[PDB]
Design an enzyme around this catalytic site. Structure first.
Site, PDB file in Angstrom:
ATOM      1  N   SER A  40      83.554   4.188  33.170  1.00 62.55           N
ATOM      2  CA  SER A  40      83.427   5.121  31.604  1.00 62.55           C
ATOM      3  C   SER A  40      84.484   5.145  31.571  1.00 62.55           C
ATOM      4  O   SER A  40      84.923   6.515  32.430  1.00 62.55           O
ATOM      5  CB  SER A  40      82.504   5.441  31.873  1.00 62.55           C
ATOM      6  OG  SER A  40      82.191   6.421  30.654  1.00 62.55           O
ATOM      7  N   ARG A  41      85.690   4.545  30.718  1.00 61.48           N
ATOM      8  CA  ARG A  41      87.057   5.030  30.294  1.00 61.48           C
ATOM      9  C   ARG A  41      87.210   6.104  29.386  1.00 61.48           C
ATOM     10  O   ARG A  41      88.090   7.259  29.710  1.00 61.48           O
ATOM     11  CB  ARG A  41      87.967   3.670  30.413  1.00 61.48           C
ATOM     12  CG  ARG A  41      88.038   2.919  31.093  1.00 61.48           C
ATOM     13  CD  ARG A  41      88.193   2.043  30.843  1.00 61.48           C
ATOM     14  NE  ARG A  41      88.194   0.702  31.550  1.00 61.48           N
ATOM     15  CZ  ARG A  41      89.293  -1.137  31.216  1.00 61.48           C
ATOM     16  NH1 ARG A  41      89.884  -1.379  30.830  1.00 61.48           N
ATOM     17  NH2 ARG A  41      88.853  -1.899  32.231  1.00 61.48           N
ATOM     18  N   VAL A  42      86.278   6.600  28.993  1.00 56.16           N
ATOM     19  CA  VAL A  42      86.582   7.585  27.854  1.00 56.16           C
ATOM     20  C   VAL A  42      85.505   8.875  28.222  1.00 56.16           C
ATOM     21  O   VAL A  42      85.811   9.766  27.772  1.00 56.16           O
ATOM     22  CB  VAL A  42      86.381   6.874  26.503  1.00 56.16           C
ATOM     23  CG1 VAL A  42      86.973   7.832  25.478  1.00 56.16           C
ATOM     24  CG2 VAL A  42      87.620   6.041  26.677  1.00 56.16           C
ATOM     25  N   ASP A  64      85.074  -0.525  26.160  1.00 53.25           N
ATOM     26  CA  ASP A  64      85.990   0.646  26.468  1.00 53.25           C
ATOM     27  C   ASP A  64      85.376   1.029  27.766  1.00 53.25           C
ATOM     28  O   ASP A  64      85.328   2.298  28.315  1.00 53.25           O
ATOM     29  CB  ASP A  64      86.243   2.014  25.501  1.00 53.25           C
ATOM     30  CG  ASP A  64      86.995   1.230  23.807  1.00 53.25           C
ATOM     31  OD1 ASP A  64      87.813   0.380  24.439  1.00 53.25           O
ATOM     32  OD2 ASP A  64      86.317   1.798  23.629  1.00 53.25           O
TER      33      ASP A  64
END
Ligand code: TRT
Lengths: 50, 140, 487, 123
Positions: free
Chosen positions: B105-107, B80
């Site tokens: 950081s995708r989230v 993620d």
């Protein structure tokens, strides 16, 4: 400096491709040897079981 | 996990010793499933299940700053996010050697505390400018 | 009690298979057949069970003239090797049969070769420093006890002299013996290395020797060469455990330790994973390295030469080796031709224990300042050849002087070559060395000229040379003045 | 026809990368470096934000309509907009958004000069 920056990538991809070509040739040979193992039959194994 | 790149070598032994058909970079082909079984077990659970968590920070070794390796991209295709440490900076005194361009950081924006969210916005913009202003001059 | 016997059933190159009538022996168990049959003694270690009574065994010698269904004696265990004081000043093959012709070896006990690695409890997480006595190493590249070290050197870079001096210093400083492992060694270098250990008295035949030698030569099959480093390391674990002391383990190129195991895995038929190295690469290499660790009871340090094929670090053999190393003692022909000996290039070297969490703070800050200095000197060296030293500021030319002083001060003599070249050797301590470089860094020793630091050890030793140089030049002036005034 | 010409321009820019990566933009003919300064603009203009990636680019997402997609490339292709700098095309949609962004950058850049004047006079 720039030419060196290109030279490292060229040397790197040259060796990457060299090693991958080596691995590939191996797997060709092993594929063929393995296929022949499948081509060869099993024997009988006759012996006393009693 | 310190580290997954060395897990794949062991599974590669087990496959090749069993004469399973290899693949790319000597690996069998089901080496992707090997990690997906593992890293999908990380999750922020639902309120139906307790709202627990299992965070997973796996480690993977590159070679000469090469994210085009099979395992590295198998795992970027699972995780993620991404944190990329550069040996150029680690040798150049900067430690931790994070490269912010190649990292993401995708989230974590939803999880970032607001106090840190705003500061992060300011510094993200600042570093987006520094990354460009440091290279465009090239000592001109 | 009696002994077990088996019968051969097929021979394919080095590989041999051995039928039994009872439970097959364990894996890695040695199997001997008498020398009357083949003409010479013959040992084969089980690798791979094929059924309830067959045992594939790799052979360490030539299996020529070996008939079929010959009797095969189970040793009861794996390759028992000699251990002890009697091992020193000798050479041993993989089986522990001495090959130096120098009579038998008077040992008491004989230990097996594949000893399991130390448990986690036996370890000592405290990272320590090995006082090498070589200031170049100690300052920038502290050899960590129980650690793995890299040595990069071709021909004519003082590789031999370094390893000889390491043996000497560890024999007196830490009171610890050493051991050499020639894996795939050219049999010429065995003579050129065993005879250097006679002129240097590292092997005093009529006295107390320091190092054990283990030569697994190229003329031997890979089943032997793969099992060499286990032998030389088993010699060292006796000194670690029983004698309770520290040990070096020199390893001629690990590349040839890896290649041999690749060959074994090929002969066994195991599919080569990658470029041609075995699938068990990291396993067979790590089973070796994990025995090279510190303990509560001693330590085994390993200086390992590494060959990089095609200068590519990405190849699995180097890459897996580097994951175990702790320091890299690089050697360059350039510095050697510039008079520096040991021919170490400190900037391209590196270490893992360089952290004040491990070492004391002064040793770290001083070393990092030297790295800064010599790095800046490399940059200014790229400027002087272009512009000129007169182009530089007053602050820059000072470090251009001090960096030259430092680089000349790294040049150290060796008691090994004291007979060859004549000059004495200097075993310089660790803390004294840091105060020396701190003086040369804080500028409190700048009036001293450059060449006084060439081929000396310790700040207390160069000052005699500085006085000698000044006295000599003063005598030449007093000679010239009176030779010109008399006429 | 526009797309054919865009693709053509980039086909030339790619060939010139092998020089620019080595020597520099200063070693190119005036025609060549104009194509460079224009192909870079096309490539930066191809970028735009999406409503999904607002977390990353930190910008609201635009929806460029087809008819307004071609006139912009045609203006950027015929040299109708060369006074605009390269960075005004990065992460926008529609040339109107460019000219807004170019005004923003001109304002900020000039304000740095008046600000630096006051910082210099007070100094
Ligand atoms: C932070 O501390 C790090 C300490 O690391 C100790 C182990 O280092 C492993 C050595 O890694 C290298 C890297 C590069 C090289 C080069 C490329 C210089 C070798 C060469 C020139 C022979 C190809 C040699 C060894």
């Amino acid at each position: 400096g720039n030419i060196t920056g290109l030279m490292q990538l060229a040397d790197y991809t040259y060796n990457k491709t060299r090693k991958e070509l080596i691995t590939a040739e191996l797997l060709e040979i092993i594929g063929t040897m393995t296929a022949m193992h499948a081509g060869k039959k099993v024997g009988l194994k006759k012996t006393e079981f009693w | 996990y310190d580290d997954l790149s060395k897990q794949a070598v062991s599974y590669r032994q087990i496959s090749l010793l069993l004469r399973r058909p290899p693949g790319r970079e000597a690996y069998p082909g089901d080496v992707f499933y090997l990690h997906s079984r593992l890293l999908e077990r990380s999750a922020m659970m639902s309120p139906q299940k307790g709202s627990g968590s299992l965070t997973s920070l796996p480690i993977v070794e590159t070679l000469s700053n090469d994210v085009t390796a099979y395992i590295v991209t198998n795992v970027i295709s699972i995780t993620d996010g991404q944190i990329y440490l550069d040996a150029k900076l680690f040798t150049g005194g900067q430690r931790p050697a994070v490269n912010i361009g190649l990292s993401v950081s995708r989230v974590g924006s939803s999880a970032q505390n607001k106090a840190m969210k705003k500061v992060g916005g300011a510094l993200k913009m600042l570093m987006g400018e520094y990354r460009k202003m440091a290279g465009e001059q090239t000592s001109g | 009690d009696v002994k077990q016997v088996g019968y051969v059933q097929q021979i394919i190159g080095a590989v041999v298979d051995v039928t039994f009538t009872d439970s097959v022996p364990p894996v890695l168990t040695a199997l001997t057949v008498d020398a009357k049959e083949t003409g010479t003694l013959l040992t084969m270690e089980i690798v791979q069970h094929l059924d309830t009574k067959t045992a594939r065994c790799i052979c360490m010698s030539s299996t020529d003239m070996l008939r079929l269904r010959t009797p095969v004696v189970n040793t009861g265990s794996q390759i028992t090797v000699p251990v002890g004081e009697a091992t020193l000043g000798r050479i041993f093959n993989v089986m522990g049969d001495a090959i130096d012709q120098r009579g038998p070896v008077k040992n008491k006990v004989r230990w097996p070769i594949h000893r399991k690695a130390p448990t986690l409890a036996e370890q000592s997480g405290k990272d320590e420093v090995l006082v090498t006595g070589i200031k170049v190493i100690d300052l920038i590249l502290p050899y960590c006890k129980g650690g793995k070290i890299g040595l990069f050197g071709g021909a004519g870079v003082g590789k031999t002299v370094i390893i000889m001096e390491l043996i000497n210093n560890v024999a007196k400083g830490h009171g610890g013996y050493s051991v050499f492992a020639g894996v795939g060694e050219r049999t010429r270098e065995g003579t050129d290395l065993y005879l250097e250990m006679m002129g240097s008295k590292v092997i005093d035949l009529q006295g107390d020797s320091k190092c054990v030698l283990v030569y697994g030569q190229m003329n031997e099959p890979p089943g032997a060469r793969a099992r060499v480093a286990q032998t030389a390391l088993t010699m060292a674990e006796y000194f670690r455990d029983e004698a309770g002391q520290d040990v070096l383990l020199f390893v001629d190129n690990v590349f040839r330790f890896t290649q041999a195991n690749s060959e074994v895995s090929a002969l066994l038929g195991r599919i080569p994973a990658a470029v041609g190295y075995q699938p068990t690469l990291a396993e067979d290499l790590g089973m070796l390295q994990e025995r090279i660790t510190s303990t509560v009871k001693g330590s085994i340090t390993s200086v390992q030469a590494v060959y990089v094929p095609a200068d590519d670090i990405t190849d699995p053999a180097p890459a897996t080796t580097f994951s175990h190393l702790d320091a890299t003692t690089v050697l360059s022909r350039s510095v050697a031709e510039a008079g520096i000996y040991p021919a170490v290039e400190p900037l391209e070297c590196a270490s893992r224990i360089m952290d004040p969490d491990a070492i004391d703070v002064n040793h770290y800050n001083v070393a990092m300042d030297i790295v800064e200095m010599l790095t800046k000197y490399k940059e200014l060296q790229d400027i002087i050849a272009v512009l000129g030293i007169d182009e530089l500021s007053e602050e820059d030319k000072l470090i251009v002087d001090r960096a030259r002083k430092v680089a000349k001060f790294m040049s150290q003599p060796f008691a090994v070559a004291e007979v060859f070249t004549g000059m004495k050797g200097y075993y310089v301590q660790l803390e004294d060395c840091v105060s020396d470089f701190g003086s040369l860094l804080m500028g409190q020793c700048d009036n001293i000229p450059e060449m006084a630091f060439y081929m000396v050890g310790g700040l207390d030793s160069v000052k005699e040379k500085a006085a000698k140089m000044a006295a000599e030049a003063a005598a030449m002036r007093e000679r010239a003045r009176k030779a010109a005034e008399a006429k």
